[PDB]
Amino acid sequence: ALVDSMEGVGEETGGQIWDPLGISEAVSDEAVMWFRASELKHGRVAMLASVGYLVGAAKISFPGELAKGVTFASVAANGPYQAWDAVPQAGKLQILSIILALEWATEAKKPHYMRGGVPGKIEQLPFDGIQGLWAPKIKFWDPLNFTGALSAEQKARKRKAELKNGRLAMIGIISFITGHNLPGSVPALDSSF
Amino acid sequence: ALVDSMEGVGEETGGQIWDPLGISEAVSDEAVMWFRASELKHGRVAMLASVGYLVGAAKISFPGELAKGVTFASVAANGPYQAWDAVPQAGKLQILSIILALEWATEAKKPHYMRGGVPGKIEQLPFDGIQGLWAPKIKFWDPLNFTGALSAEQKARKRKAELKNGRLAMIGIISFITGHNLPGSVPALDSSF
Amino acid sequence: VVYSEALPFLVRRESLGPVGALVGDVGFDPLGFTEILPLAWLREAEIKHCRTAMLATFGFAFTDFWHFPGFDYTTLEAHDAVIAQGGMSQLLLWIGLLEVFSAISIDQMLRGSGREPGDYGFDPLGFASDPAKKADLQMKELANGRLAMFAFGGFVTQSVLTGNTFPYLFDYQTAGDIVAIAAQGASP
Amino acid sequence: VSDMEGTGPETGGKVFDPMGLSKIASAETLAWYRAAELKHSRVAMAAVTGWAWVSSGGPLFPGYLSVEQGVTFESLGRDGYAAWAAVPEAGKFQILGVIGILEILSESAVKPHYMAGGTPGKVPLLWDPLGFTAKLSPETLARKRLAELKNGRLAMIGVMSLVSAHFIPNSVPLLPGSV
Amino acid sequence: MTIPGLNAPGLVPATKKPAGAKPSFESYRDTSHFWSSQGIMDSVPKV
Numbered sequence: 198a199l200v201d202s203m204e205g206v207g208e209e210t211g212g213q214i215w216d217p218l219g220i221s222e223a224v225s226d227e228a229v230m231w232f233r234a235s236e237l238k239h240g241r242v243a244m245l246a247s248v249g250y251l252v253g254a255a256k257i258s259f260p261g262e263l264a265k266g267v268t269f270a271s272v273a274a275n276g277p278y279q280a281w282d283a284v285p286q287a288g289k290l291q292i293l294s295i296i297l298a299l300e301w302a303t304e305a306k307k308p309h310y311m312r313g314g315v316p317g318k319i320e321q322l323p324f325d326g327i328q329g330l331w332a333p334k335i336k337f338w339d340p341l342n343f344t345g346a347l348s349a350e351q352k353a354r355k356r357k358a359e360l361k362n363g364r365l366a367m368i369g370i371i372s373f374i375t376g377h378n379l380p381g382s383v384p385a386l387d388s389s390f
Numbered sequence: 391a392l393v394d395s396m397e398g399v400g401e402e403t404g405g406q407i408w409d410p411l412g413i414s415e416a417v418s419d420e421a422v423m424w425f426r427a428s429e430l431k432h433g434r435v436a437m438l439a440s441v442g443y444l445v446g447a448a449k450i451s452f453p454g455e456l457a458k459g460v461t462f463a464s465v466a467a468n469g470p471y472q473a474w475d476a477v478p479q480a481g482k483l484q485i486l487s488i489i490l491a492l493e494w495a496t497e498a499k500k501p502h503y504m505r506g507g508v509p510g511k512i513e514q515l516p517f518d519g520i521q522g523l524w525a526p527k528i529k530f531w532d533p534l535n536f537t538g539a540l541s542a543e544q545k546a547r548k549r550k551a552e553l554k555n556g557r558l559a560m561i562g563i564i565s566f567i568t569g570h571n572l573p574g575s576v577p578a579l580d581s582s583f
Numbered sequence: 584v585v586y587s588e589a590l591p592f593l594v595r596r597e598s599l600g601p602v603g604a605l606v607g608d609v610g611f612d613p614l615g616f617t618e619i620l621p622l623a624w625l626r627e628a629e630i631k632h633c634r635t636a637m638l639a640t641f642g643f644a645f646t647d648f649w650h651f652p653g654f655d656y657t658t659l660e661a662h663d664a665v666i667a668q669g670g671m672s673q674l675l676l677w678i679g680l681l682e683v684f685s686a687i688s689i690d691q692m693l694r695g696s697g698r699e700p701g702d703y704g705f706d707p708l709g710f711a712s713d714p715a716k717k718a719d720l721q722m723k724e725l726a727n728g729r730l731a732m733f734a735f736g737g738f739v740t741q742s743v744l745t746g747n748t749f750p751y752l753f754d755y756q757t758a759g760d761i762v763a764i765a766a767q768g769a770s771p
Numbered sequence: 772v773s774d775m776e777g778t779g780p781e782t783g784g785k786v787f788d789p790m791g792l793s794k795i796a797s798a799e800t801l802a803w804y805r806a807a808e809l810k811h812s813r814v815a816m817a818a819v820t821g822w823a824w825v826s827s828g829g830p831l832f833p834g835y836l837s838v839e840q841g842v843t844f845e846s847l848g849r850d851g852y853a854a855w856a857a858v859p860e861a862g863k864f865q866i867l868g869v870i871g872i873l874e875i876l877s878e879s880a881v882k883p884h885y886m887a888g889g890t891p892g893k894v895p896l897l898w899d900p901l902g903f904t905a906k907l908s909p910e911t912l913a914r915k916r917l918a919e920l921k922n923g924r925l926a927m928i929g930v931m932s933l934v935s936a937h938f939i940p941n942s943v944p945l946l947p948g949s950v
Numbered sequence: 951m952t953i954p955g956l957n958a959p960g961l962v963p964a965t966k967k968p969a970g971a972k973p974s975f976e977s978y979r980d981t982s983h984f985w986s987s988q989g990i991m992d993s994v995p996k997v
């Protein structure tokens with residue numbers, strides 16, 4: 198809700214709300230909740246993207262065919278950046294369709310992160326309680342229920358770890374994209390990237 | 391709810407109603423009666439069609455002639471799919487006319503199923519009670535009264551079996567037709583049918 | 584002070600009626616047609632357009648795939664072809680009988696018979712017979728039909744613009760990559 | 772995890788979980804682990820038995836597999852991977868689809884779900900149609916469930932030995948280099 | 951005649967072209983019933 202009560206203040210920025218600009222002071226409370234939800238979304242997206250980009254650069258690909266006549270090796274041979282274009286249109290159409298479904302379902306839950314919901318706490322079972330739609334009760338987060346064996350303090354510590362890993366992941370994925378676009382912008386990125 | 395007091399619930403979906411999309415929850419009870427009546431009619435028509443299509447696929451036919459020029463074997467020669475097209479026109483018209491008579495007489499019963507009567511319980515004598523119309527009283531279902539020998543619980547179990555078999559045949563006949571249309575869509579069907 | 588729930592910077596009008604006499608009242612009426620025309624007439628027109636647009640978009644999509652043996656025309660030229668054949672005359676005749684009866688009902692409803700805006704009483708299968716579900720099903724009808732108007736408009740316009748059968752999408756959208764990230768040139 | 776069965780004298784009465792994957796497992800996670808173990812064990816038992824029968828020299832299926840297209844059980848050969856390559860794609864799709872239907876029936880039809888407080892590995896139809904394991908007491912039934920787990924764990928290692936011998940040649944001893 | 955279902959198929963698949971470039975605006979405006987001279991002259995009743 199309010200930045201004083203929110204997590205994320207780390208040690209890297211001195212046990213203090215790191216807001217160099219006056220954004221938190223200038224904006225209202227629900228704007229802060231929107232920012233926190235977007236921060237978590239960015240961190241999680243960038244974590245997945247960074248791991249996938251590293252895998253693509255390492256050329257590790259599943260044994261089989263992405264499509265009939267199109268092998269995972271075939272799409273991965275040119276590089277990580279070009280693999281997305283090499284993917285057939287229907288596959289990423291399906292990916293963006295399921296992402297549309299996930300985003301719309303997570304946004305449709307009524308205790309909204311802006312309107313009295315925990316920001317960043319995506320509702321598990323997002324496709325549940327929806328008329329005209331049935332999906333198996335596979336939780337979006339932790340389908341195996343890994344977090345059940347954690348205490349509240351441990352869960353808070355791991356939420357802090359989530360935030361501090363997500364910020365690094367945003368930095369890393371933008372580093373990968375910038376290095377590929379403008380060579381030499383990001384060193385430690387060889388020709389494979 | 392009328393949906394909570396039927397025989398179609400089966401252990402294959404647990405001990406619970408199979409309404410994934412809440413269609414039965416989004417309609418009034420009259421539509422639920424219509425749904426059960428149409429479900430059972432579809433199931434029964436489907437199993438008639440399924441066994442008939444298997445018989446046609448096996449090239450099994452009566453000894454004799456379906457007309458004065460065509461033979462049963464001749465009209466069955468091409469296969470089950472084109473058999474209906476190769477049937478003579480007058481025979482198709484006669485089948486459609488007798489089906490018209492059946493589905494008019496069964497509809498014209500005043501207890502009905504939409505308006506306060508058992509859905510799926512076709513009146514055993516559709517053409518009785520019709521003024522100035524005579525029928526030989528061959529009761530439509532159980533003309534030789536098999537179900538009379540059964541107890542109430544026995545025929546309840548057999549009604550559950552009817553619903554299960556009708557749904558399975560609903561799947562099966564369309565599997566046959568779809569396998570004929572798209573080759574390899576249903577791999578269990580050889581090129582014969 | 585009641586503000587329109589669709590445009591919270593405008594006051595409700597007045598001619599829209601009590602907030603909620605009509606399913607879907609989100610107060611969306613920036614141009615104030617309710618002052619000129621009566622709301623019952625406007626709502627009858629709304630539901631007629633909804634139903635016709637639903638049937639039209641479904642028929643357009645269906646005719647893009649399947650047609651009867653006699654009619655060997657595409658969806659665009661079907662109108663001219665079946666006017667020449669004479670079927671559209673039959674559709675006009677029968678829909679005109681139905682529409683004369685409908686117009687008599689609108690006249691009675693506006694003069695104060697008691698009929699609701701678009702309640703023809705058509706309910707054979709018994710959907711919405713329970714009053715609890717009736718308002719929700721009216722709202723769903725309106726939502727689906729108001730979507731269907733835009734659906735049919737997009738269908739026809741994109742169909743003529745592209746020349747493609749079902750998707751109404753250009754050849755570059757259908758064949759090429761609409762999710763590309765490598766730098767594009769001048770043309771799609 | 773200590774009260775979940777599968778422990779035996781082979782571990783020493785204790786749970787074998789060196790990496791500590793049981794510490795981070797809740798009741799649902801532990802149920803998932805047992806369900807996956809049971810499924811993998813059963814699959815590996817069937818796979819090892821089939822591969823051993825086919826490759827060893829046992830009397831395989833008589834007759835044709837496909838009258839049209841001219842594929843025969845004898846013609847498919849005794850190498851397991853070559854046989855699964857030469858079996859028709861229709862047959863492969865059919866086997867996979869029936870297994871999928873059975874998986875979805877196991878997931879949905881068993882309403883008290885193994886994740887949502889149920890018995891892991893309780894596929895209802897595909898067990899004992901003739902009623903053999905019907906009168907066994909709970910003690911011997913628990914003994915036999917532990918037997919299932921142990922035998923299938925061995926079977927998983929066996930089938931992985933087989934595919935390792937086929938992929939990385941001359942990998943496992945007591946498996947000729949070809950497969 | 952062709953009774954649909956009795957002596958002929960029921961629903962028949964339609965003939966379609968596999969994609970194509972955008973027709974020019976003047977290609978269909980010059981044939982449209984409202985923005986073409988011949989289209990307007992043909993957009994009349996018949997008897």
Ligand SMILES: CC(=O)O[C@H]1CC(C)(C)C(=C=C/C(C)=C/C=C/C(C)=C/C=C/C=C(C)/C=C/C=C(\C)C(=O)C[C@@]23O[C@]2(C)C[C@@H](O)CC3(C)C)[C@](C)(O)C1
Pocket residue numbers: 815816817819820903904915922923925926927928929930932933943944945946
């Ligand atoms: C030195 C070296 O490297 O060696 C190599 C070579 C070597 C050793 C060969 C290797 C291997 C592979 C091995 C050893 C693989 C082992 C595989 C294994 C262990 C496979 C079990 C199948 C069980 C089944 C199908 C049981 C069904 C049983 C059924 C259907 C029943 O239980 C039914 C029933 O009983 C009940 C429950 C109740 C009772 O009333 C009776 C009945 C009948 C009704 C390795 C790993 O490569 C190492």
Ligand code: KC2
Pocket residue numbers: 263264265284285286287288289291292295
């Ligand atoms: C976000 C993840 C995701 C999900 C949840 C998901 C679910 C389902 C389901 C639901 C149960 C079905 C039934 C289904 C079916 C097919 N998927 Mg699919 N899919 C996902 C991702 C991708 C990607 C990236 C590709 C892809 C493809 C195919 C092809 C291949 C056809 C072909 O061989 O041409 C078929 C038949 C590939 C493709 O379309 O290639 C042209 C391809 O690249 N999918 N997919």
Ligand code: KC2
Pocket residue numbers: 456457458459477478479480481482484485488
């Ligand atoms: C269940 C449905 C059904 C019923 C209840 C029913 C009843 C009666 C009755 C009593 C009420 C009479 C008196 C009668 C008479 C004839 N039926 Mg008929 N019939 C049914 C079905 C078919 C089919 C499928 C065909 C057919 C035919 C003929 C021919 C052959 C003429 C010929 O030799 O050409 C004659 C004379 C065939 C046909 O139309 O042939 C052109 C043909 O294929 N019927 N049919």
Ligand SMILES: CC1=C(C#C/C(C)=C/C=C/C(C)=C/C=C/C=C(C)/C=C/C=C(C)/C=C/[C@@]23O[C@]2(C)C[C@@H](O)CC3(C)C)C(C)(C)C[C@H](O)C1
Pocket residue numbers: 630631634635638651652653654668670674678681682685951952953954
């Ligand atoms: C619901 C509603 C409304 C509406 C509506 C709408 C738009 C309804 C539309 C209905 C529609 C579109 C219904 C088509 C039927 C087609 C038939 C029966 C075809 C016969 C075809 C026959 C008999 C024959 C065809 C042939 O090819 C055959 C087989 C052989 C060939 O030799 C040649 C011929 C030509 C002979 C209102 C009234 C507007 C307002 C109200 O508020 C809400």
